[PDB]
From a paper:
ACs contain metal ions but not organic cofactors, and use ATP to activate substrates through phosphorylation. The first structural rationale for acetone carboxylation is presented here, focusing on the 360 kDa (αβγ)2 heterohexameric AC from Xanthobacter autotrophicus in the ligand-free, AMP-bound, and acetate coordinated states. Like many carboxylases, AC is a heteromultimeric enzyme complex. Its architecture consists of two heterotrimeric αβγ subunits joined by the interacting α-subunits to form a dimeric core.
In the absence of bound substrates or nucleotides (ligand-free form), the AC structure has an open cleft at the α/β subunit interface leading to the nucleotide-binding site in the β-subunit. The ligand-free structure is assigned as the resting state awaiting the binding of substrates ATP, acetone, and bicarbonate at the nucleotide-binding site. However, the structure of the native AC shows the nucleotide binding site located ~40 Å from the Mn site of acetoacetate formation, with no visible pathway for the transfer of reactive phosphorylated intermediates.
Residue numbers in the entry:
A (entry chain C): 2 to 167
B (entry chain B): 88 to 572
C (entry chain E): 573 to 621
D (entry chain B): 622 to 717
E (entry chain A): 14 to 776
F (entry chain D): 14 to 259
Amino acid sequence: AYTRSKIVDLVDGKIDPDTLHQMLSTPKDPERFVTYVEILQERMPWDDKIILPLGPKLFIVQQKVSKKWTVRCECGHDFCDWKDNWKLSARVHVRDTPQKMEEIYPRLMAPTPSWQVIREYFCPECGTLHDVEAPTPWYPVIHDFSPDIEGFYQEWLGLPVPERAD
Amino acid sequence: QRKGLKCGLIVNRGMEDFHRMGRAVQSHLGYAYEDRIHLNTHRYDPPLVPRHLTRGVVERTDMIGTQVIPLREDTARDAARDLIAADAEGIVISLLHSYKNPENERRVRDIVLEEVEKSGKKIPVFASADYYPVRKETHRTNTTILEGYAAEPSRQTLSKISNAFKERGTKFDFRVMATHGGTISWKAKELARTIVSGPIGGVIGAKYLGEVLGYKNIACSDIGGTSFDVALITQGEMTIKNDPDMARLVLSLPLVAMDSVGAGAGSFIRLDPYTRAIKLGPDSAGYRVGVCWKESGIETVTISDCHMVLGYLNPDNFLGGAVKLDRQRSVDAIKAQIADPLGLSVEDAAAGVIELLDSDLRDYLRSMISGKGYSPASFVCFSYGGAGPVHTYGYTEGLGFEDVIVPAWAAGFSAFGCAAADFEYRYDKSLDINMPTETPDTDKEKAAATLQAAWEELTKNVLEEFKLNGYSADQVTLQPGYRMQ
Amino acid sequence: YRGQLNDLEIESPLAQAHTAADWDQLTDAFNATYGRVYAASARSPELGY
Amino acid sequence: SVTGAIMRGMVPIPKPKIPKEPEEGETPPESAKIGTRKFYRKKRWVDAQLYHMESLRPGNRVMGPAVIESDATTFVVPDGFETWLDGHRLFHLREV
Amino acid sequence: TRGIVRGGETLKEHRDRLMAATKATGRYAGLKTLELREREPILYNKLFSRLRAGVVDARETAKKIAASPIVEQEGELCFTLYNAAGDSLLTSTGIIIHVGTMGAAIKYMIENNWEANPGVHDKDIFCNNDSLIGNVHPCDIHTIVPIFWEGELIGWVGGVTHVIDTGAVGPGSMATGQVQRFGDGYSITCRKVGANDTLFRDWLHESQRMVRTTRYWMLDERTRIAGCHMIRKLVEEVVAEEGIEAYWKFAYEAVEHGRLGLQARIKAMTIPGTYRQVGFVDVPYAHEDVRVPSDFAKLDTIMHAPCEMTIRRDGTWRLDFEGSSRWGWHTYNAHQVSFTSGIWVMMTQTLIPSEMINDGAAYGTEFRLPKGTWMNPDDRRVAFSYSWHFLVSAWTALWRGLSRSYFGRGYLEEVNAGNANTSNWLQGGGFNQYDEIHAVNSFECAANGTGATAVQDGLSHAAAIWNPEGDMGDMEIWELAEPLVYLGRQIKASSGGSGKYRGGCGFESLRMVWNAKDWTMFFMGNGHISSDWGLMGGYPAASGYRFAAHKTNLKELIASGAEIPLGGDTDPENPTWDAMLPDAQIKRDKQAITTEEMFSDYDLYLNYMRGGPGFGDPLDREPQAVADDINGGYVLERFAGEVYGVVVRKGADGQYGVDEAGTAAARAQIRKDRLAKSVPVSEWMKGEREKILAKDAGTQVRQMFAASFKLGPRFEKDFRTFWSLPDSWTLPEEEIGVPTYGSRYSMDISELPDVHTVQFVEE
Amino acid sequence: TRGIVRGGETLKEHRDRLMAATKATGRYAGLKTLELREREPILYNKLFSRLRAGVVDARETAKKIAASPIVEQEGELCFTLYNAAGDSLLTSTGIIIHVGTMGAAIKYMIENNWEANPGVHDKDIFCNNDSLIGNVHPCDIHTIVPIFWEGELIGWVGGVTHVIDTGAVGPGSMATGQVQRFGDGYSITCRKVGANDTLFRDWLHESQRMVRTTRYWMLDERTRIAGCHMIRKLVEEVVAEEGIEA
Ligand SMILES: [Mn+2]
Ligand SMILES: [Mn+2]
Ligand SMILES: [Zn+2]
């Protein structure tokens, strides 16, 4: 239903309130995903197809030649195969002292790092912060999302699955 | 339309933030069931007074008038100088619990008044205790800000009219319709009481008309040059909300429950540059009707211009033919602006605007009724915009109203409800009578004595103002009442 | 009753026990006498036997 | 707890008198016809009758398409609707 | 002996039939078709429209009876209409978590044969708040009225009010002090409290003297009763006007409609797959100012709530809380009903706002809550008065999980990084300005900030997870019910979580004790740990701290014209009030949970309501937004550069503007610093693994894992696999040195006589 | 409408009349002479000897129902018989301080119009331990049964047991830990807990989960109920044998 430029504004954080309320209060537009993902595609500097957005600067992607599925930054860096935790192949900054917590919180409003830690996760090439965790000491890294990509495209969207190698 | 005046505010120091925090509430005021829970729907409007035009004085008065922190008058002088320097256009003062003890808030007001005199500037001051001496500070401050923001421009109007009329030989004082459906005097400085005076005019005429003809359940529908006003008369009465909201603002004045949507005969027809969709309003053309009137200087087409294209309006009978309305002006401006950017004929250009409005008004009227728990078949629909009889078919089609009535005097229907309004004066005095259940008949007569006194003190007030209006006590019918809990 | 410290002797209504409903008679006999020894409302079957 | 006291004061005033006209035939007078206008609704043009509001009589009926005009009110009855006037100068929209 | 339900069946037979059909068929009550809705759709919505308006209006009207501002102004009350089996048809808004809690009491009565004794009769009145049957906390009190028609039960009405206090050890409603049920306040288990529409004198006299704020409680009772009876009358008028046939069809077709509604919205808004997320909060009971009587309760601990969220191709979904930690000696435990209705209120706020709000979505969700976890205790000594501590820290994770599916699919308008910790709860007791025994409990934490979006900043001072219609209430009204005066109300700067879109900021309130006698106060929120996490970037909101000043010498300071503390505590790391109070005993620390503490007139208490987490990498935020945050008071200027890479210069007007070249270059430099200061996760992991093997962590970190492994073996298996730990490494809870009472031995309510409890959860 | 006491007067009118006589006269109820005792001293002592034996023997029997040794072996239980106005006539030995506590509970009901609401009906059962009305401590729980004759109240039976615990903060009966009423344990203010001789399920479930030593508490209820009902039955047999006048 929605105008294409209006779903762009929504991505750019610039959409008007009337259409923002319209989008929220009425049944969703079945066409959203295919318009959305195409909007993201034309904003990448690499022509490999996008399969699913993982964050603002993070995607599951289909290699134009090998047809493998991978996690990719917007800049270009492939982290891992899509069934793996990308964070395992990323770089991490751990805020575990009052000095580091007091860089992003005023004292007293910072968590205490013997109870809670800030783990920031960056792309190796561009330094982009794709995710920040707030667990305890010892706590494993978290595999956020394992999507059923086949069922989504095939059963919920009525679309062929993109070609896939291993 | 938030087109008021650049108004500033002085409140208690340390609490300057409360206006713009909107008591949280105002991020969901007037929300349908579904959006009250749909969290991502909540949204704050701009504050009436921004943070850089708020200031704070150091004073504190507790819930019974005791001055815990006495007013440090210096902080009031800097407060005044700050907003005078900021070129504020009016200054509002709201100090906590001033309704109970206004000493400190009226000293602040005097100090501010002093500083504006020295500045030479024309800045009026509004003490909340002088206007709305009632609890709940977000309600009181919003209402008082209204006197500065929006009331002040039309403050001239009631004295220009009343002067023009006594000059011309009237022997009465005008009354104004007020938010609770009753009339007040034109002299009152609380013009915000008279803010929904026009719409309430219509609701009262429809109420009156119903009483004569036995219609007890009436849905009122008014379409003017700018908006579409809608209320329900449920079993002979209107509903009056005590501490209501209106335009997503908490207010301290009792209000008649109504609703509207911002479309009317003069609402402007524009196309989104990117969507190329039609957006009606929200602004209107007003007494300038649109392009169809040659001398109006209006360049954007209005719904009234579609009326001419489609044959709804008679070009030679606007105001009885006292006003020249040219159809070909409407046709050329509809083509250039709407029809050709949309690849449609001027007929289909105009008909699609009217069709959208028809459905938009219809779905609103259906939904305000659904929302209040009623079926449209439980009601009779009075329609009386002055431009509403042009779309009675539209917003009523298939709703299932028991009957749909266009009275012949539809065009002045509010002015009909105003001439129909009771000549009534009301007077109030608060009290502190506390009784247990088990009480001896002496504490019981003492209580009845003090209430008996207040009615007599009030009774002489009603009669004394009716004397100044040329009415002896014999003509006044009196009805005492009281507030209990 | 299950948590108690004292018991009641009861003359068996059956010669021979055995089968389900017979255990039902033995509880029933008990209850009955407990009503006599004490008071009908003294009975607390919900504690078990 | 008695929290306040109130006093109301009414004086009589001429309220506007609602007409109570005798109702007559459903056929409106030839005097009330003021010609037609080109009227466009659902992709269709029709010659819609024009009626002088004041020249209508209690009991008349007006089948759409027609517009009812006076000095300052325009009452639209498209094709597919109908109106009749009662003794109180009220009209009634029917679906029809 | 005819049963009392409209059929002739008993309450128990009637519900047992309906749950069997539901189990066998997969549709509520077996309804494979919705006769009324499909065949008489006009009549179906007219009933819906007229009844849902009735309950909305009942809540709004009746709340004008209460003295407490919690009910009168904030609206912490709810009205729900139920069918015979205790399933909701419709509800007013407000604290709608009690849709399910009152539904479970109705079911507990059904399952324990209240029908035989004490009997469900027309005009009867039931009152209940028992947490062991699934209520949130004793301070939320239910009134339940059966509805009869032509001599048979056709449904129930429930009304809930949040009451100021229920006479726990702690003075307040979220009280600390007590550590078990015994002391956790006046506990009512489905009591018959009236007959023939009239209350029992022995209930009135007993109930009113078990609490402090008696007049407030008394009026909170009338607000419930009046609402129940407005709704009972509404139904009778609706049935008499449209017929029992239609009403009876509607009373059950509505509930399958709500299940159908959840399924369809999942399929249109979501992505099938698996979502993993976790949440924590602190319980610092070791500290000196948590004075609890039982020595076995003085240890620090952390609530651990992992959620495996499974979304299926058929549109059902599953929430598995394997790995979760144990209940404890505090007042933060919950109940399987508490927890699952909490998750339902969240889906009313994103998934189904525009569908039927009733138990339908409940029947369309799968819940696995291991027995013995805090969310499903197996002990009848457990305490509840502040369940929200844990509850609101678990549900916030699920916003994030559910938000990844909107984001991948393109419904960015619906992404939300999660709820604020709905906290600090200003509480205290003593003699008030009317010289009556009294207790306090500010609902200012109804207006915390909310999670940022993928589209725009979170709302500041706006909502709570348990009621999206935020209200902070007027200063002038609160001062009628507490013996305190406001010295400030202020947006709480840098409370919002940073990001591309900033989370909503909390706000702050500075109070002076005034006209109080023999008065105490305490604090109750999260301190050491932020419950919410940011999303796709995005940092947690600020955590909590305490500020109290005793012996301020403020009578003299006010009178002599000296500086006095006003507004908020703008930079707690560089405070301004402390310098002003050279004689005071100032408590300024992280201990966000305390017990009762003597206060006196002119002492100071800072009320702090939390912020919400943010979205995206902060140095993607638009710089102008950062500058506006600085002027608007939302972010302290210090972190403009340090967090967002935004360089700001103050103009002649004194306001901040953007230095654009500086801001670009600072962002360029931050990216290199991030490269330089991070390490491959391989590298970090072998470091943390060494700390684990060495058991290098505070006792509260080691207790969270020890207890969690024991309740959730699949979680221990996963930890051991992840860190590659030998089977020689073992973490027995008994080796940590801290008390471990209730870790092996426990006794459930269901082990008491005649108790039949209802199970709603996989367990 | 007509009061429930054997006279036709209400409980309140009945006691108010009797306390006024006592105030004006200096003798309980105005009795300047003792009709029965002076005129039929044989009948007077025969009633005395048979009724005091009844309460002694009721206490002794029913204490074999309890699991708690406090009641079963130590005998910290008491049974008292009262007139309509709540004055004791006779008691078993044991914890006889509750002669006065249960009397003050009976009188609290009289003064607060329990008769109008919740009503004192035959076969009803009251449970109470409220210390603000004059009970020693929450752990001493009263059962109070009215006794009726030909449709009118002629007196009450009270039974007391010391219970192991009532769910205070402290585990025990003489508990420390709590410092106010709030936390001092399950406090029952003259609750109607049964009718037609049967306990109410909502009282059963609620009360048993407010304490620790549940099985003990349950059986302490049955020891109380049984003694009351042995004593109610006793009186009726005494009255049926000797006459309501005597
Ligand atoms: Mn609550
Ligand atoms: Mn004792
Ligand atoms: Zn990169």
